[PDB]
Design a protein around this nucleic acid. Sequence first.
RNA 1: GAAUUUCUACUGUUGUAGAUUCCUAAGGCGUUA
DNA 2: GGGTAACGCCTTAGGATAAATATGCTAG
DNA 3: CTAGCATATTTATCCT
Length: 1186
Amino acid sequence: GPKMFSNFTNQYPLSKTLRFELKPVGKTLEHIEKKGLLEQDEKRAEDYKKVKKIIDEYHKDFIEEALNNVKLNGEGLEEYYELYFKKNKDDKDKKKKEFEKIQDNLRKQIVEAFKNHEKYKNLFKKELIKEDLPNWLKNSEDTGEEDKETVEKFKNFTTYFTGFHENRKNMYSDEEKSTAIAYRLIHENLPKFLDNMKVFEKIKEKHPEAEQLEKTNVEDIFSLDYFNHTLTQSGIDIYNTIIGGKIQGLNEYINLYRQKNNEKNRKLPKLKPLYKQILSDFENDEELLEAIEEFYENLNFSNNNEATNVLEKLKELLSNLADYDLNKIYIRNDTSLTDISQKIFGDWSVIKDALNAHYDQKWLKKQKYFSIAELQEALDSYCKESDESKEQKENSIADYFKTLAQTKNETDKKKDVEKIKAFLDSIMNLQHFVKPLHLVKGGSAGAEMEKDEAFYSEFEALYEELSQVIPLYNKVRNYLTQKPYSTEKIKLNFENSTLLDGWDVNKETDNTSVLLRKDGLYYLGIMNKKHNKVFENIPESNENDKCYEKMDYKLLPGANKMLPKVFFSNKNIDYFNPSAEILEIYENGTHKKSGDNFNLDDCHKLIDFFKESINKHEDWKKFGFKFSPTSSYEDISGFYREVEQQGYKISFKNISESYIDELVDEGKLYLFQIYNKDFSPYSKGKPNLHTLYWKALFDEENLKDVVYKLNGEAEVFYRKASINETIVHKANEPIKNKNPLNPKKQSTFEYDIIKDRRYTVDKFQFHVPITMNFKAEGNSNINDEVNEFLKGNAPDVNIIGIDRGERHLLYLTLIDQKGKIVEQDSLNTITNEHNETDYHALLDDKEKERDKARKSWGTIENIKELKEGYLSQVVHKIAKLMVEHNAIVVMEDLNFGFKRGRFKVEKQVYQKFEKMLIDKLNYLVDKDKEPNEPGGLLNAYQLTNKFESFQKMGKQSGFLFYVPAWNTSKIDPTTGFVNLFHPRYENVEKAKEFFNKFDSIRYNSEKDYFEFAFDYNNFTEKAEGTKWTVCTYGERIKTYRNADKNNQWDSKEVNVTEEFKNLFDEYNIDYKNGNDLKEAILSQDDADFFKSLLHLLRLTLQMRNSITGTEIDYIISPVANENGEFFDSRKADESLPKDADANGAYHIARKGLWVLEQIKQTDDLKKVNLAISNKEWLEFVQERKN
RNA sequence: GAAUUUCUACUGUUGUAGAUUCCUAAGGCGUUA
DNA sequence: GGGTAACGCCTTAGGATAAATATGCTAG
DNA sequence: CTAGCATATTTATCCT
Ligand SMILES: [Mg+2]
Ligand SMILES: [Mg+2]
Ligand SMILES: [Mg+2]
Ligand SMILES: [Mg+2]
Ligand SMILES: [Mg+2]
Ligand SMILES: [Mg+2]
């Protein structure tokens, strides 16, 4: 039943941001436009970006000025150096504790260097933008009045930089966070420095020197006590340019020195550069047409002042190549030779084989440019693999050149993209063809001897005119290829530095924002900053008139900060009058547990004082606080949690509609409507999930016991129109349906349907942060509870396995505790309550669509978005199956245990799918369940730990278990047979030794198949399982090769029994009587027979028989299971996988079953390990009795 | 040639079904012309 | 495969606040 | 000289 997840609700809190659209009401938009609140806020974005860049430059200079004067102790540096070189050993107390201690000491030294500088006192305050930044700009000579004006525009608006200052505070921190300077300089740069030191101390001390030592100080860069110099960005740059790789560097020297096999193999010791210091570093179609016409005129011209037409001049010059001497004409060694071989002979390797077999035999002295005469000589004798005895090549190179020059097509001479693209295609095809004869740069590995003047002198001047296409083609491909709509939105402030930062009643003349509600529609009023007291004094609240519902939001944000601040402030300390004992308790930190002076009595006394002060405070005693007895508090954390949980209430006050209308009309209030398509009068179906969250924020049931909290610091954005031309489906005209399974062929609408209507007009935005499970205990890691429940009670817990199939996008298999399969279904088609969608067909069609439209340069993209919008349906299906069938979910481990390629859902997409399922199961609601029923809106399931990173999650994420997908597809489902063989092919001796360890090779008189009896103990350094009996009945499909004709990736159904019979009979081997075949197979000789026998042996052991063209893909067993029956996926009994992709999901489910058995058996929970091993998995599948 | 806070599949009829945590900052890696 | 940055991913970090306090303006 | 008001800016710092 539902007992499994009934106790896994309300575990830890979550925070999410809901997005809406703001529709201005009445004269809101008119007044917004009149006061120019949109241009101002779009200019503020540019000003904010420029001032942030200026502050970044200021921080750059401060970092360069601070780290320059720091001097590390050095002895601690030597301690870190020796600890880093103490070998692997073990993670004992020393290797970890002293490592962390020295790292923290160095980091704190760097941070102390930061703090000592005078500029650090007011680096994150109003002083920075008021005085320090203008003074710093004035000091700089280059400066600029524009920069000073931009900074001065924020002289009374500094609070707008609070988030940026918080972002920039992370760099000057002690904690080991990636966004820090000390952390970088002690954890990332220094290990690279020591690695460079050790690779130098190895390679240089070896002394096989052939490079320049650069000695004829110098070596001080690599010695110790120099890490102080490379602390700044200038030092890092100096170290990198010394390393190098326009000044010669050590890395360049060593890379050039790795040749002649003296040190070439030792490429790993290559010097890695240090990491960079933190925070340190066409127009239109008319112009394109003009450039195209200019190049056309430059190409053809009008045949004036001699023939300047490059198209025919180059053709004539190439036709004249035969008359020119071939002893001085050079040819490129690049893929142009491959093209020449493919065109002249039809084989792309003839010329290269001639050059590597007849021209010379060492490393061939590889040169960039060969000579035409040498190629002619080589082609005159190329061993004539398969051709006429005498080949009429003549001047084969020149013959091919002139052939492609004129007789190839006789069509070289010639606004729409098609014509321009075809012309460009022909042009750079010709330029690629003529490129081999061009001399690249000068002094390219020698050669470049005295050239043919009469040919090459004209050729070099002719080719430069045609070489202008490459930059032209680059510009064309850069300009022509650039999405229909745009998602750039301007943030709106409404003249308030702190807007929407909080909803509290007291803090509403400062944030100038309220919520209103009427007839189930939620509005948002952002009052003008000039009149911010309009809501302070409501004239009346009579109920006869139609009334809005203004929200009375009250909150106590943080108890640990708010309580001492209010109760221990010079303004209020007299009112509350803390006793001397309480003041001493707070000062000495006795209440805190982190301090060594922890005292339960002091903490309880402070808690009692806080309770009394809260009772005294007028705005806080209205919260209706109800605390536990003070004697039950373990520490101050419990009291703070209680205050935070109970310090939040929402009430709705009634205000006249006429007052709001007058405020909107007069321009004092900007009234929007928080809108969603579920808020429309025509909406009738199930509302969106975020709409349910928003409406539950203010529900009476929710407000009785808060589950949803309205968080402050919201944002209002403005998105401009992005799509000018519209594709509109006119009204009263039938529209063809896009769903083939839909019975209704056409639909008629009495109104227009504009494509992407949300992007053709200006739309406001509203991002509302909300919190789920406000009063949650905080069990962020439910693994201990899930494991305890699974061990205690699991007679009815099923297992679900998800594997990305080769053909099927994703395959699902649900199994019991006994391994019996209940449900098998490929997730390629999702059958929801409506007609099913063939997502496999969609992706299959759209991949072809994208690859064919890429040449057309239509920026369709998609594919990714469809595959990332497909996985949402799969996540919904998985959640439904988990809730309905009481099953855990087991998946592939993509960190350690990932699979190969050639699956539809690649590793990158599968990681995102796993992340999406983890996120969904963090808070899992059903739009159909009751609000209070478990799994409903107010009692949501929480079946997964909060997601932080792919690496942080281990082998268990709550109810999701991760297993290595090693040996999950190519295993028999019935028995546990696995093909662990790695035969390969070698000489006769090793093959004969291999076949010598088979127990018994024989022919079965009955049923007409071979028996290959053996034991796994003879093969590989493993001792597991028992002796198997591999047969020759269940292996059909075989492929010849990977490419080319007469051998290809083409399936050929062949009976291995018949082929084995023919192979044995054709060398007079007798097997009719049924005798053991070990004799007469040791006859040796005829190695090809051994290759054939070994290929059949590999053939008779493959599990997955696949055909590329046809969809059939079946797994068929080579061994029987206690009844002389060989498994076959084709003739399955619905208790075994029906498909070659089903086997992976079934075996992942079985791995999860093994995980469940391990959890149940162990009595040492909260410490047990779940990472399965290959030996244990092999023993599990080969468990004899099931 | 298809409406959406936003995405995907739709017509499920001014919308249907299921995802949907947003803003800012820093760093690392990969394709290539 | 020799010392190129426009895109495309990944990692990490801060926040999702009311109230005390300092400062500018009116008034004197 | 100048008490009071209104606004902008900073601050208060649990424990797992
Ligand atoms: Mg303000
Ligand atoms: Mg709906
Ligand atoms: Mg798999
Ligand atoms: Mg498979
Ligand atoms: Mg929708
Ligand atoms: Mg769409």
